[PDB]
Write a protein that binds this ligand. Sequence first.
Ligand SMILES: NC(=O)CC[C@H](N)C(=O)O
Ligand SMILES: NC(=O)CC[C@H](N)C(=O)O
Lengths: 525, 525
Amino acid sequence: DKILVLNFGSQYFHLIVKRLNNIKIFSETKDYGVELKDIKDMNIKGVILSGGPYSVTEAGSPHLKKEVFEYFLEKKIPIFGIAYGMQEIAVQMNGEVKKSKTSEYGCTDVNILRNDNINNITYCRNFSSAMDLYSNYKLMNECLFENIKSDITTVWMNHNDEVTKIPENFYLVSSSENCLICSIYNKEYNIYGVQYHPEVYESLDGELMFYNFAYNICKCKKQFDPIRYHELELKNIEKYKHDHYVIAAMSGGIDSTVAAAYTHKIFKERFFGIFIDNGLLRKNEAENVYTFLKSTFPDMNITKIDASENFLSNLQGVTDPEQKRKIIGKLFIEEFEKAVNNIDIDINKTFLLQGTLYPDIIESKCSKNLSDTIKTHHNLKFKLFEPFKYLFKDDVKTLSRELNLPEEITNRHPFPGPGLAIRVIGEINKHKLNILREVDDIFINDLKQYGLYNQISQAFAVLLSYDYVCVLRAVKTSSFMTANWYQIPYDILDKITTRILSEVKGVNRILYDVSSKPPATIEFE
Amino acid sequence: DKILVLNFGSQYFHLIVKRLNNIKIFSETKDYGVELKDIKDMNIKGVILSGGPYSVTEAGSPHLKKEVFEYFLEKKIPIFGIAYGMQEIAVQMNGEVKKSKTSEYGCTDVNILRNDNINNITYCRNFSSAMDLYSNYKLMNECLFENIKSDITTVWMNHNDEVTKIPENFYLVSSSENCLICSIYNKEYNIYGVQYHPEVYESLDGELMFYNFAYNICKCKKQFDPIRYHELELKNIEKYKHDHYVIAAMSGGIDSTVAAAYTHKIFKERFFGIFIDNGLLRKNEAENVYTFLKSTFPDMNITKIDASENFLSNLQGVTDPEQKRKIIGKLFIEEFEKAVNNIDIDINKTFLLQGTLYPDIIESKCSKNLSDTIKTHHNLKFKLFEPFKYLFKDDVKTLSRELNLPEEITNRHPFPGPGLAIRVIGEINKHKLNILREVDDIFINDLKQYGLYNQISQAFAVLLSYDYVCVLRAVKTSSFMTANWYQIPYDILDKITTRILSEVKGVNRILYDVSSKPPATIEFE
Ligand SMILES: NC(=O)CC[C@H](N)C(=O)O
Ligand SMILES: NC(=O)CC[C@H](N)C(=O)O
C-alpha cells in the first residue's frame, strides 16, 4: 500500500516523507507533472499535494493535468492538499483562490468546526457576527480529525495566498484569524484540503492527521505496529546503566514523577532525586510532595532542599514580573547545582533527566509568549535525557495508570515554574504568601468537593495585616497559546466566595477572571 | 375599631402610638396590668405589647395575667409583641427566653424567611450549614409582610435578651446575625412576635407592617383614606409662591427630575434649575442629561455648569478615597453657590429643593458606612425643602409614570455623588476616564440590548496608553447596607467581555466582582 506524494516546490517536502516513515507507511515520490502511465501500474491508495513558492493562479505556475485528476475519483483514491496543494484542488474544481488580505507565518491555532464550534470564533469581523458569516458555508458533525483532544490545534503557517471561494460542494472544516476558509473536506470524492503544513515539526497533530488519513481513510493494511515508543529511548540508555549516573529535578509534577519511576528501575542506585522547596509552592506541598515521593518510591534516593529563605530574601523589593522570573530561574539553577555538588559523582558521566513532552518542545521552539508556560527550567554541561520528547500529555496519563499510581497525580493541574511569585502582585512577602495560600487552598478543596477540578485545565488564586483583593482563575486550555475561562455554576461559586470572605482574615473582596486568551493570559504577571 | 396598646416601660411607647396616628387608626392606652373588666366593655380588635428595660424571666418583672391572655384567643383578637413584648408571648406559651450570646443595638437588617429564602443566610455558624439549622424550626410561604419590596428590612435594635426556644407550634419568620429566632408567627391564634422596634423612625417598614396588621389582619374599617401625601407638603408651600424663590441641584436622577417637575409648576418663574457637569459623569451625560431636561421642561430655567476642568485639576495626585470624596464634596458646594450667585435673588427668601426620600434620611441617620451612598451632597443657610422626606423609591416611580415621563428615567440605576472618581483606582486622569467610559458604556448598552438592566439594582465598571484591568460590577440591592452580586448568564456575559477586549484599546483583562455586601461594598474605593 504505497501512498503517492507529489512535489510542487515545497521546502518541507522531505518532512512529508519523514512523517510517513515515522508512522511506518510505505511511500513513493513523483513530481507534479507525472504522466498517468507511471502511477497506473503502481498500487496507490492515497494522494498528497505539497506546497510551493509559486502563486496558484499566476502564469507558468505548476499544476496537474485535467485527465490525471479524473483518474483518482473513479478509482476511489483519497486526496490530501497542503498549502499550495489545497489551492490547486480549489482551482481545478471551480474554486477561486486569490491573494489574501493578510499573510500568515509561524505557529498558529486553527479552529475545528462543527455546528457547535461556531460560537468559539471571535474574529468574525476580520473579513460581522458568528452565524451571520458561516451561514454562507457548510458544516457538519466533526473524519480526518478522529481521536483529537481539543477543537483547536497548533499548526505551522507559511503562505500569502488563501482560498476565497470554496470549491463545488465542499465542507468548511477549519478557520484561522487571517484565513477564513483554511481547511476543507469533500464527502463526495473523499478529498481533504489544508492551508497549513502538518508535516512540519512545529505542527502538533501532524502525525495524528496522517495516521487517520492513510489508515482510517485510505485503508492501508498496517504491517508495522510498534514503531516509536517511550521505551525505545529507555531500552537504548540501558547500555549506560553502569557507565554513568542519572539526576533529575523532582518537582512533583506528573511529568517528573513518572519519568523518574522508570529511570529508577534502570539506575536503581545510580539515580538521584532532587526536590527543591522554593517556598513558592501551594499549601503543604513543602511536605506532602516529599512525603508522597518517599512513600511511593522507597528505594529511590531523594534529596529535599529548603531554599525558601534564599528565595524570599532574593525576591524582596522586586515587583517586575520579568525580573521576578529572571531571579527564580537564575536561582533554581544554583540550588540544583549545589545539590548535585553535595552528591560526589562523575560530572562528565551523568545524565540530566527531564520529563519533556512534544508540546513542551514546540512551546519553547515557537517563541510566542512564556508567561503561562509550565516547564520553566527547561555551569555544568550535562547529556540531556528527554525520553518523552515525542510524546503527548494524554500519553503520559496512560503510563501513570499502568504503574498503579493514584489518579491524584494524573489529575493534578500543571503548576508552572515561578509558582506563587507571579500570583502575588507587586511586593512579595512571607505574609502575603500565607494569605494567598489560605485562599488558594480553599478554592481548590472546594473544586474537589463539588467535583469541578477534573473539568478544568488549570485553577488557582491571585492576590491583589492589610485587607487585600483576591482573583479566582479557572481556565479551559485548548492550546498553549489559547484558552477560555471555565464557567463555574453560581451555586457552587457562591459557596466558595462565601467561605473565603468569612474564614480568611485579610481579604474583603473576591473577583473572578472572565477574560480569555488571547488577548489576556492565564497568569497575571 | 380601637387597637389596644400595652406599656411595659418602653422608651419608644409614644412612637408606637405616633405610628398609629400617621396611619390614622384609633388607639387607646392601657398598662401591662389592666384588669379584664376595663377592656371587655371596649371594642378591641387588636393587641400590641411594648418593650421594657426589665428581663422577661427575672424576679419582679412585668407580665400579664393568665386569664387575660385566654381572653384574646377566644374572641379572635390578633396579638403583636415587640421586643420585651415578644419575649412575654414566649414565656407564657411554653417558650424559653434566656440571655443572648451577643447583644444588638442600632440599625440592623433582618431576613424574611420562606423555604426559598433559607439560602440567603451566611451566619449559620454563629449559633453549621444552611438547612442543617433551619430543619429544627418551621417555615412557610411568605401575612404581616404583605406588599414588601425585598426579603430584607432595616430595623432598630435595642435589647440584650433574645428568644431561645420557639413557643408551642410557632413559625420562624425572621433572623439576624445575632438573633436567630427574631420574629415569629402563630397561624393558629393569629399571633405575631418581633424582637426589634418597628415603631422607631429608623425602622424602614414600620408603618407598612402596621398597615397590614390592623387593616389586612385585624380588619378595621378604615374611615380615613388620604392622610400623608407628597402633595400635602406641596400644597403647604403654595402659600409662599410669591414671597420666596426655589433653587435645586438638577442632577439628572429620578429623585431630582420629578421633584423639580412639581416645584416648577408652582414657582413657574421663581424656580432655578442648576445642573453641574463635574466631568465625573458617564458617557455623554454631559449633554444628554442637559438636552433631555430642557426638552422635557421647556419653561424651566436651566443653568448648565462645566466645572470639569476645576474638578480634574483639583483631584490631581489624590489617590485616597476619603480625600477624593472630601474634595468632590467641598467643591460641589462651591460651584453650586457660585451658580446661585450668578442669579441675583433674595438669599434670605429662597428654598433649597432636595428630592430626599425616607430611606435616604435613615441611611444618613443610622451612620453605618457611606461609601456606597447615593445622595452625597445631602456659606448660605437655606430653608431646606424636602417634600419626599416620608416617601419611598417605589412611590416616586409611580408619580413619574403619572407625569407621562418615559421609563428611561425610572429604570435609571442610582448614580452616586463622587461619580467615576471612586471608580478610577489610584491616580485620576482625563485619559483614564476616557478608557473607563468606553468600557462602562459598552457594559451598560449590552445590559439593555439583552435585557438585564431592569433586573439589576446598580451596574457599572471599575478601572484598575498603558494596558489596564477592568472590573464589572452588578448587584442586587436589598438594603442600603446589604446586597448580592447579580448572576449574569454566561452566554450574555461572554459577549460583553469579548466585545470590550476587542474594541477598547488600553485594556487586556476583564474581571467580574463576585463578592457580596457584607463584608464588601458596592463601590471599590
Ligand atoms: N508555503 C506555501 O505554500 C506558500 C506559497 C505561496 N506563497 C502561497 O500563497 O500559497
Ligand atoms: N428594648 C428592649 O426591649 C430591651 C429590654 C431587655 N434588655 C431585653 O433583653 O429584652
